[PDB]
Amino acid sequence: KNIIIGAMTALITPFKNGKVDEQSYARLIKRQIENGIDAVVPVGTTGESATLTHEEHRTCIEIAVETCKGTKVKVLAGAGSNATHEAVGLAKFAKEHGADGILSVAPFYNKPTQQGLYEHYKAIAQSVDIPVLLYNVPGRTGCEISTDTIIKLFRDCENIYGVKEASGNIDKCVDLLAHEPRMMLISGEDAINYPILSNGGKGVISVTSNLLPDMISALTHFALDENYKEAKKINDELYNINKILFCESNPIPIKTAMYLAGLIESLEFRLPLCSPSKENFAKIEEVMKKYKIKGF
Amino acid sequence: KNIIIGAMTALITPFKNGKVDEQSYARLIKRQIENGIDAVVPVGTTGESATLTHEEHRTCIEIAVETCKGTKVKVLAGAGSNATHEAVGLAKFAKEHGADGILSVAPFYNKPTQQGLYEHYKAIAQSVDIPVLLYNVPGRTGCEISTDTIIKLFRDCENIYGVKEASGNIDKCVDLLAHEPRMMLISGEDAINYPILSNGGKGVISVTSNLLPDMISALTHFALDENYKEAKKINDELYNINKILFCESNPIPIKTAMYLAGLIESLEFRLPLCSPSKENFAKIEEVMKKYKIKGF
Ligand SMILES: N[C@@H](CCCC[NH3+])C(=O)O
Numbered sequence A, B: 001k002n003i004i005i006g007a008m009t010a011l012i013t014p015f016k017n018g019k020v021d022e023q024s025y026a027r028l029i030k031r032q033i034e035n036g037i038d039a040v041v042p043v044g045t046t047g048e049s050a051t052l053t054h055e056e057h058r059t060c061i062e063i064a065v066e067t068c069k070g071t072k073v074k075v076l077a078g079a080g081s082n083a084t085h086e087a088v089g090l091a092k093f094a095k096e097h098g099a100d101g102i103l104s105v106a107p108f109y110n111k112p113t114q115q116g117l118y119e120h121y122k123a124i125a126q127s128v129d130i131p132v133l134l135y136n137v138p139g140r141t142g143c144e145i146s147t148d149t150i151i152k153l154f155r156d157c158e159n160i161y162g163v164k165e166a167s168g169n170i171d172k173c174v175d176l177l178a179h180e181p182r183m184m185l186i187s188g189e190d191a192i193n194y195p196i197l198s199n200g201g202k203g204v205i206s207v208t209s210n211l212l213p214d215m216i217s218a219l220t221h222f223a224l225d226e227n228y229k230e231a232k233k234i235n236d237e238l239y240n241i242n243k244i245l246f247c248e249s250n251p252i253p254i255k256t257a258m259y260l261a262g263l264i265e266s267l268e269f270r271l272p273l274c275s276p277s278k279e280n281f282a283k284i285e286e287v288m289k290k291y292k293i294k295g296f
């Protein structure tokens, strides 16, 4: 199976005057590349998938592919949708435009059954020939991809190679890899990056890495080499910032931190996302003071 | 405040060969009109908003408007989105094409803060001059519109007149009407229609009414006329069908029931939605036989 693993970043999508800031997007990706990141994920939850048009979604995938050209960094393109025909379209676009693989979030809002999730992902996987990583985040979607469904998809579809888990459920991570040790379990939850990796997870798709790519990168590669002492020390050091980046709904805190660090020009979200409370703004600024934030 | 209340139906969207069956849609609406229903809700969750294109979404609203033309039945158009620019577009279309009001589900998947929900709905309400009914269903969206946010929106925006609650939380329904008794609280949870109405709720937006419109309309009108003994008797009789219509995720069971009753031509969904299990299919069929289903 071909895979996309290692330290990976869920890219924020910067806006300027309501539009996608395209030179800022490329500069941010370059910064990720230069700080040891193995793959970038354009337009997932952290990239405000919901409020981008299908056109802008495709533009961000193109900038990501073009920027990683001539490097080892891969593009795991965000391509999920709660409509199977929409998810297949994004997957086909990502393949035709040079993505190395796709991330595909479980359908949100309409809550398909396990049978429906299976058929949803099989249709996506059969539409292209690049790796497909499932993405389970039940707190945001309202549905869960069960362990049985994940394992069935991995065994039944050649290009489905694993899952990004954002479920706060280390029991499920044991279940997954105890019954199907060939799959690539990816941490979707920065605070518990090390425990997932120490159980045989093979990478992370990180929010914190937007701000501290070098630290998340070192953590992941220490862990992959079974240097657990070093990996845990970094995971422990990162806990405070990992938690404060979800004081409000992601990506409101991470965009706030990137702006405070001078890495993006203006805060700016697209509604219904908005700027944090003054309290949380001050809390994010405080926690940031304890870390070294690389510039450009 | 101008309002839309009473017994209302979250319309299923029938498909034939994968496209919207517009003649079946109009025929089902007429069936609703003839059984005492006060308003219809095109393209909600029950109408598979997620998998309709923006254009089919608009077509369904138009059919509802024509079919209710010249009748006392109102059209409360499904116009929600997790992207504020999308929700404003749908709201303006509904207004421009003759809907009496709009339903607007809380943004799903991207989990805005309470401040974001306020700005989201303030933008929608300021875009049109027809009534706007908020819609809270946290099990599907991943977010909750707090009682404070609902009340602030009701008091601050002229056209925002109430909320459809599908949260299984009668405590919140007391909270809402104890602090703001002027709003229109609408039941979005069939099994507890009567308790919500008996606390001063003023209508239902029902899934069960697709199959038994006469019973749901009677229940609502009994309750509004303060005949709580008869409203409760119907709510109690309907409990079994009200629960079995959610044995799987709505609208998989209700479409299964409509097909079993001979009210739609084919049991077709759009992926990721699919047919129920064989077991569930048999369970829906067995419960249906205890009720009298109106024909055409
Ligand atoms: N509001 C839509 C936008 C999809 C198009 C861009 N990803 C959704 O969240 O599904």
Ligand SMILES: N[C@@H](CCCC[NH3+])C(=O)O
Pocket (backbone or CB within 6 Å): A081, A082, A083, A086, A109, B049, B050, B051, B052, B053, B054, B057, B081, B082
């Ligand atoms: N699947 C997307 C697009 C729906 C557009 C038509 N209602 C969503 O749920 O937001």
